[PDB]
Design a protein around this ligand. Structure first.
Ligand SMILES: *[C@@H]1O[C@H](CO)[C@@H](O)[C@H](O)[C@H]1NC(C)=O
Ligand SMILES: *[C@@H]1O[C@H](CO)[C@@H](O)[C@H](O)[C@H]1NC(C)=O
Ligand SMILES: *[C@@H]1O[C@H](CO)[C@@H](O)[C@H](O)[C@H]1NC(C)=O
Ligand SMILES: *[C@@H]1O[C@H](CO)[C@@H](O)[C@H](O)[C@H]1NC(C)=O
Ligand SMILES: *[C@@H]1O[C@H](CO)[C@@H](O)[C@H](O)[C@H]1NC(C)=O
Lengths: 48, 229, 235, 48, 46
């Protein structure tokens, strides 16, 4: 959930208003970008 | 009171979302695996009052459908609100009134409702649907979460060997009904339809434990492990 | 909404609403407050709800703030307690033209005192200390249900306000309540945007081998993204 | 503090109401996870 | 909270409250605006 109301994005769009969603989906984008940066860091160490 | 062991029972489907070939971990109120549960055998009569303790797993082994239903309530009298489950040959009646129960709410002797309740005040609920209920093992899980009554049921006949023992097998309990009762279920008591017969029923209490459920293909929970066992 | 007879706060009545379209637009047409939690108010129409429960009661105007998540008070702790994580709307409107008399209103009462705090979505329809009351009034004894005694000459914070709480769950069950949205014919084996029971996504829809049990309405992947859906019109 | 009102968890739970804390403690949790991801990344590089 | 004459905004009165037990439930007794910064209203009695 990454500190949001749901993991899916289309619920947060439908359930919450556009200003309110941009707070939840910014958290979700930050969490998924952190996880992807962790994956490209660990894959770079494994590649070394 | 006699105590027996629940070997792997008490596992239900936690949510109404299919999952297949997935080992999913859920933290919810479940019956701890390998747990001591109370065993009551009736042919004096064992119809006692038992507390709820945020979840009840009920399992009954019988032939003649003696164990018809249950009552749920706080103080089990007419000053407070109470639930009722009554099953007969046509249907089942789930009814939430302010019942004045008798001390021995034996159903019928037929004498119909008879001494299960004396009066109904501020009755607000009446769900009537298809009835809930060699030996036949009938398993029930009762949860009262945020004013919603959740019943999980599974019917599967079992064999004897040692007399009156819970079986050593894994059977997931399918959700049956969700009710907005909005009452405080603190205590409960089963109902026995007295009329040559035999019945035995098992009561276990749920605890908040993490379970790793083994969904496979066909979407059935076939195995699970208690994390804190 | 348009009912002359409502319910007292201590014995609030909860109305099951299911198997129908709910046009929230009519409520917007009706002097009214529409504060919603979990769903924002404008987005209610394009959604499908599992079950809609209406909690109808009458309180004063200053006690509307007590009907809130995480809120402690008289009405919140002793009459009607709300959960911290529900999904629903609170609707409050002034009805002093129908719920106020010159002598007073003994139809609606409130539980003034209680032994313990009351758990959310529960209803109590039932002694401070020292001597026991034993069914009679005495020292440190009170009739917990006290009358509101409404009058039209009272202040606005003490005027009778009629509050209904619409509670529901989302994407956890087969949805009996849906918004008034026109249906579209189903096509398979094509890349098409889809809105099944309020779930919006772009995907190719194909016949599925999975046999959903009657309770199951959706299938979830290991990423918690719906991988299969049961069509509402045709199962 | 990671932009929150305090570094420690307990005054943020005792001071702020649950909706407001869930944002402040999420900001602390994300930052503490970042510091602990930085430590694990630097331990992986030094272990290599 | 109750004064026959509140002070004017240009010369606001500052009252020091100390060495006592404060219950904030009484305030809500008196249309009430109660906006709290850095803290929430319910948690004050804790
Ligand atoms: C369960 O009950 C049996 C017999 O009543 C006893 O031998 C056993 O020790 C009990 N188990 C626990 C965990 O108390
Ligand atoms: C079973 O109970 C229902 C509910 O009242 C009743 O209408 C029906 O007649 C009963 N059937 C019997 C007693 O065979
Ligand atoms: C799943 O369904 C198939 C039917 O094609 C059946 O052969 C198989 O035994 C089922 N699996 C389980 C675990 O029941
Ligand atoms: C339910 O009833 C019990 C009776 O002891 C009472 O103490 C408690 O406050 C109530 N709890 C709930 C779940 O409302
Ligand atoms: C309405 O929906 C039901 C689903 O149970 C379906 O069987 C029926 O054919 C539908 N009728 C029309 C006119 O679409």
């Amino acid at each position: 959930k990454f500190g949001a109301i749901s993991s899916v994005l289309n619920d947060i769009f439908s359930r919450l208003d556009p200003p309110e969603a941009e707070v939840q989906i910014d958290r979700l984008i930050t969490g998924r970008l952190q996880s992807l940066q962790t994956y490209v860091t660990q894959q770079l160490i494994r590649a070394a | 009171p006699a105590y027996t062991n629940s070997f792997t029972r008490g596992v239900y489907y936690p949510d109404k979302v299919f999952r297949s070939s997935v080992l999913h971990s859920t933290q919810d109120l479940f019956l701890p695996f390998f747990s001591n549960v109370t065993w009551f055998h009736v042919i004096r009569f064992d119809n006692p009052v038992l507390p709820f303790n945020d979840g009840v797993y009920f399992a009954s082994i019988e032939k003649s459908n003696i164990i018809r239903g249950w009552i749920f309530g706080t103080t089990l009298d007419s000053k407070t609100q109470s639930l009722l489950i009554v099953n007969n040959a046509t249907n089942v009646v789930i009814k939430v009134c302010e019942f004045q129960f008798c001390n021995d709410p034996f159903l019928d002797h037929m004498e119909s409702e008879f001494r299960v309740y004396s009066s109904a005040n501020n009755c607000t609920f009446e769900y009537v649907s298809q009835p809930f209920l060699f030996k036949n093992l009938r398993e029930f899980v009762f949860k009262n979460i945020d004013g919603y009554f959740k019943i999980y049921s599974k019917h599967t006949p079992i064999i004897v060997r040692e007399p009156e023992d819970l079986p050593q097998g894994f059977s997931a309990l399918e959700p049956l009904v969700d009710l907005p009762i909005g009452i405080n279920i603190t205590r409960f008591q089963t109902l026995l339809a007295l009329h040559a017969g035999a019945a035995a029923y098992y009561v276990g209490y749920l605890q908040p434990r993490t379970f790793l459920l083994k969904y496979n293909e066909n979407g059935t929970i076939t195995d699970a492990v208690d994390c804190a066992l | 909404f348009n009912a002359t007879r409502f319910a007292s706060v201590y014995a609030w009545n909860r109305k099951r609403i299911s198997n129908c379209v709910a046009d929230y637009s009519v409520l917007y047409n009706l002097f009214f407050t529409f504060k919603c939690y979990g769903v924002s108010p404008t987005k209610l129409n394009d959604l499908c709800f599992t079950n809609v429960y209406a909690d109808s009661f009458v309180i004063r105007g200053d006690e509307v703030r007590q009907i809130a998540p995480g809120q402690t008070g008289n009405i919140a702790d002793y009459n009607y307690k709300l959960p911290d994580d529900f999904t629903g709307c609170v609707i409050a409107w002034n009805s002093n033209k129908l719920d106020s008399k010159v002598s007073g209103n003994y139809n609606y009462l409130y539980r003034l005192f209680r032994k313990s705090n009351l758990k959310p979505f529960e209803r109590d329809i039932s002694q401070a200390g020292n001597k026991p009351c034993n069914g009679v009034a005495g020292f440190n004894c009170y009739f917990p249900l006290r009358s509101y005694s409404f009058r039209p000459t009272y202040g606005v914070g003490h005027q009778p306000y009629r509050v209904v709480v619409l509670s529901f769950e989302l994407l956890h069950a087969p949805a009996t309540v849906c918004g008034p949205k026109k249906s579209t014919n189903l096509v398979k084996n094509k890349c098409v945007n889809f809105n099944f029971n309020g779930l919006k996504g772009t995907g190719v829809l194909t016949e599925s081998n999975k046999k959903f049990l009657p309770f199951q309405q959706f299938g979830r992947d290991i990423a918690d993204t719906t991988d299969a859906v049961r069509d509402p019109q045709t199962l």
